[PDB]
Amino acid sequence: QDNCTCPTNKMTVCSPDGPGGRCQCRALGSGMAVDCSTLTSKCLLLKARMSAPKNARTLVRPSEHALVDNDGLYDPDCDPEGRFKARQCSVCWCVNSVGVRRTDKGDCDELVRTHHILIDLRHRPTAGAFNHSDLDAELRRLFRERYRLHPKFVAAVHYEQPTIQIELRQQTSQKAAGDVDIGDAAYYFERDIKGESLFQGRGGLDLRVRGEPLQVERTLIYYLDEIPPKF
Amino acid sequence: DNCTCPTNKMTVCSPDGPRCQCRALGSGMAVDCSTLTSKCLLLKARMSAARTLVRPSEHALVDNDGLYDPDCDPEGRFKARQCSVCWCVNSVGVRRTDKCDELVRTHHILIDLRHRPTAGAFNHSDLDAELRRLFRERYRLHPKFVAAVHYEQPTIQIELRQQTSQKAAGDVDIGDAAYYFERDIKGESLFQGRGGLDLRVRGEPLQVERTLIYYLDEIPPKF
């Protein structure tokens, strides 16, 4: 690219205003300097998305009194290291390391780590055939190359046509310094599956098993914490 | 040659009447196979149904409110109260209080779809006409209850609107139409014998990448 880019985080502004005119990119909505060679933390990415200046044009906004099947979205508080703060708030709750609520809403002594993540994808039935071996090798390649996740953290892949499952497992103790967190890889993967790459200049996930493209129709993601949630 | 239930595949059908009779899975209630089944009964079917697929831990968290097997009334509507921990729900079964005098109806639904960018051209006129055709033909919703379609590439919105006073006896409810549509978009047709939604616009097959659904009640939530 002729100008500066941030391959791992398009939610940035890049300037040749760095030392010696080098490229520097800063995160939208927080301002944290971003390492454009590794994944940005989910917390900081959520802050960037909430800060995004939407122009609705002729789209309508949901009413403030409208209900959703989700817990709702929000601009999170992140600590200086980019992690979710354990408490998120005028009403408050505790979250785990992927930002998901793990207590009832009240008025948080630790950030409970999410150490196991189950991603369940149903793809559109297709004439192209593939087996577990193919799927396992391909997802491991994509997690290493696209998300920079070490394959030791892909604990398992399961396949019962047309349902793919990926199990990510990662204890804090298993993480070398700078290792990508499964919680961040899962989030980038989730957004890729919804057709929103968070990368800059890497196209879509474009999942193929034998070069044959798969169309994901339904995504479910389950998060298991190191201590059970307290509802 | 056999009995089917075009509007509800979550049934077992047998020639038992005076005549095909189709009973809902997971409740056994007889089903009217000429109109949409209530979302409440379809959720009970879904919950009453793994090989090498793993099940999530009972302690796993999700980014939604959690799926449950609801209580329905003898007309197949959600009972207003769902339950140890109890709460009130609206007519699409969504919780509207914290954990119930009436079943408050959802009278406006916003469906927000983002489609994959595609080479085939189309515009709002094309989308409006096609989505209105599909909601009448596939989802059996009367035309007046689609209030609006909006398009800012690649986002499509459909607004459904159906006030209690404007819903005739026997009309399909917008909440059931929205549920059938939501499941179709996720690649699960609830119909029997009608294939997929297979959305195509000005001749272009479209792939939906992301669905968001907003429900607005005739009485505001009390949280």
Partner: antibody
Framework: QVQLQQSGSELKKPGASVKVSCKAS????????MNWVKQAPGQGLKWMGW????????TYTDDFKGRFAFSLDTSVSTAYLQISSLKADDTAVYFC??????????????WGQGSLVTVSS | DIQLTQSPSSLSASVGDRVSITCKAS??????VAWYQQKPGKAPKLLIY???YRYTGVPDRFSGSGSGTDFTLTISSLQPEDFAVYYC?????????FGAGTKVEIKR
């Protein structure tokens, strides 16, 4: 019998235009991107850009834009390379090469045989 | 653009020799490096993608390694059909770029 078949050699005067075709057969054309690679006589490979056959959108590079145009006719599974205002340094073999739509598939598994374009007065 | 420094520009080897060709990227490209072989008058053939994955039908003697900035294509035992030009390519980000090529020639 997955194949890309390109059009034949071309000889053009400076200032002229040329259109090179790349016909796909044996696979679903809109499931893959089509990439264009230049190889001047005696030189190495240079990526010119590509066209997303599903969205129809071309992506050019700094060195190949303006008078280079990538287009498609999906009804006959064909991608085209048009070069206008030809100059002698355009003399080269042009390859089309199939790839995917995202970076973990942006390597080229199936290639055309190449089309030689020679520009001379 | 990501510059690839491919070395050596040429090498002479005998049938039976272990041959290694390196590709240095000007910035970290994960494992997204492909290698191609090209003979005279022919299109290039894909050998390796994602730094170490052999493409269908590519013989076992071709292998790839590396991550980050430094990559290596290895021919574990050169065979008579392997004298050719080899190219690396990065597929980390657009624009896609190539190394300048390595000509593998017959030693005598």
């Amino acid at each position: 019998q997955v194949q890309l078949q390109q059009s034949g050699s071309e000889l053009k005067k400076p200032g002229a235009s040329v259109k090179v075709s790349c016909k796909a057969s044996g696979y679903t054309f809109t499931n893959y991107g089509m990439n264009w690679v230049k190889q001047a006589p005696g030189q190495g490979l240079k990526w010119m850009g590509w066209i997303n056959t599903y969205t129809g959108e071309p992506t050019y590079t700094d060195d190949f834009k303006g008078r280079f145009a990538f287009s498609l006719d999906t009804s006959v599974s064909t991608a085209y390379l048009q070069i206008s205002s030809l100059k002698a340094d355009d003399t080269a073999v042009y390859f089309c090469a199939r790839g995917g739509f995202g970076s973990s598939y942006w390597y080229f598994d199936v290639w055309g045989q190449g089309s030689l374009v020679t520009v001379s007065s | 653009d990501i510059q690839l420094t491919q070395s050596p520009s040429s090498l002479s080897a005998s049938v039976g020799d272990r041959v290694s060709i390196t590709c240095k990227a000007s910035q970290d490209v994960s494992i997204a490096v492909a290698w191609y072989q090209q003979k005279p008058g022919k299109a290039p053939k894909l050998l390796i993608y994602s730094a170490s994955y052999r493409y269908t039908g590519v013989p076992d003697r071709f292998s790839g390694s590396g991550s980050g900035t430094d990559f290596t294509l290895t021919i574990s035992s050169l065979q008579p059909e392997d004298f050719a030009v080899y190219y690396c390519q990065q597929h980390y980000i657009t624009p896609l770029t190539f190394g300048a090529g390595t000509k593998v020639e017959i030693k005598r």
